[PDB]
C-alpha cells in the first residue's frame, strides 16, 4: 500500500562488534488496521530481531519464507559473504540500511501474510520491543542437525514422486545458481580488492600534478592538467 520510511536516529551504545541502534522507522500504510494513520517508530537492533525470528519460526512451522533482515547472532557472524561484524558500526551502516529496506520491501511483498496483527502493532509502536531477543538457545540446533543427517539418507525414494515434476527445475537452477554465484561473487571480491587501489591510483594521478609542479611551470599546461584533475575525479 504505502511504505515510505526514514531511517534516522543512530543511537550507538557500543562500537565495533555488533553495534546496536534504535533507528527511526517512518510507518506509512494508513489503512484502518494502522490506528493513528501518521506515526514513526524507533526500532532497537537488539530488540526486534529475536522476536522477529520467533515469529519467523512461527510462520515457518506453518510454512513460509522469511525476508532476511540485517543479520546478527550467529546468522550475521558466520559467512554472510565474508563476515566482519566489527565493521557493522560506522561504515557498513549503509549496507545495514540497504538490506534493511530490502527486508522491508519483502515484508510488503507478502500481501496475503501482510495482515498479521501482532507484528503490525509491534512495528506500529515504539515500545522498546522485548529486549530478551538477543539470544543463544540453539538446543534445537543439533536436533535439526541430525534431522538433516537423516534426511540426507532418506530423501531419495520420496524424490521419485510427483515432487520430481516440480523439483527438477529448482535442482537445475540451484546447480547453475551456485556455479554462477560462486563465479560472480568471486568477481565481487576481486572488485573489492582492486577498485580501492584504483581509487588510490586516481588520487596519485591528482598528486602527479604536484609532481608536475616539481617541474616546468607553464600555465597553458597547468590549466589543461588541472582540468584533467576534475575530469578524472568525475570519472572515478
Amino acid at each position: 500500500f504505502d511504505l515510505t520510511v526514514g531511517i534516522t536516529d543512530p543511537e550507538k551504545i557500543g562500537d565495533g562488534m555488533n553495534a546496536y541502534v534504535a533507528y527511526k522507522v517512518t510507518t506509512q500504510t494508513s489503512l484502518p488496521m494502522f490506528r493513528s494513520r501518521q506515526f514513526a517508530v524507533k526500532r532497537r537492533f537488539s530488540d526486534f530481531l529475536g522476536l522477529y525470528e520467533k515469529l519467523s519460526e512461527k510462520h515457518s512451522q506453518n510454512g513460509f519464507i522469511v525476508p532476511p533482515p540485517p543479520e546478527k547472532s550467529l546468522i550475521g557472524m558466520t559467512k554472510v559473504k565474508v563476515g566482519k561484524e566489527d565493521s557493522s558500526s560506522a561504515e557498513f551502516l549503509e549496507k545495514r540500511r540497504a538490506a534493511l529496506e530490502r527486508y522491508l520491501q519483502r515484508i510488503v511483498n507478502h500481501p496475503t501474510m501482510l495482515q498479521d496483527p501482532d507484528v503490525r502493532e509491534f512495528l506500529e509502536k515504539e515500545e522498546l520491543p522485548r529486549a530478551v531477543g538477543t539470544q543463544a538457545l540453539s538446543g534445537a540446533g543439533l536436533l535439526k542437525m541430525f534431522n538433516k543427517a537423516t534426511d540426507a539418507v532418506s530423501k531419495m525414494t520420496i524424490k521419485m514422486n510427483e515432487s520430481d515434476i516440480w523439483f527438477e527445475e529448482k535442482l537445475q537452477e540451484v546447480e547453475c545458481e551456485e556455479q554462477r554465484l560462486r563465479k560472480l561473487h568471486a568477481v565481487v571480491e576481486t572488485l573489492v580488492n582492486h577498485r580501492k587501489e584504483l581509487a588510490l591510483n586516481t588520487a596519485l594521478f591528482a598528486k602527479s600534478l604536484a609532481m608536475l609542479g616539481s617541474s616546468e611551470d607553464n600555465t597553458a599546461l597547468s590549466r589543461a592538467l588541472s582540468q584533467l584533475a576534475e575530469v578524472e575525479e568525475k570519472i572515478e
Binding site: 513460509f64 519483502r106 597553458a220 590549466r223 582540468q227
Partner: protein, 48 residues
C-alpha cells in the same frame, strides 16, 4: 504453489529492480556524461 508463484512474481519484481538499476545506470550515465562533456565542450573548443 503460493510461495513459488510468489517466487516467480518476486523474481520478476527484483529482476525488474536490478534491470531498472542497469537502465538507471544507463540513464544517469547518459545525463551525467552529457552534461559534463558539454561542459567540457567549450574548454575543448578553446584551450583546456
Amino acid at each position: 504453489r503460493k510461495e513459488v508463484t510468489r517466487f516467480e512474481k518476486e523474481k520478476s519484481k527484483d529482476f525488474k529492480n536490478h534491470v531498472m538499476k542497469y537502465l538507471e545506470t544507463l540513464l544517469h550515465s547518459q545525463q551525467q556524461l552529457a552534461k559534463y562533456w558539454e561542459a567540457f565542450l567549450p574548454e575543448a573548443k578553446a584551450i583546456s
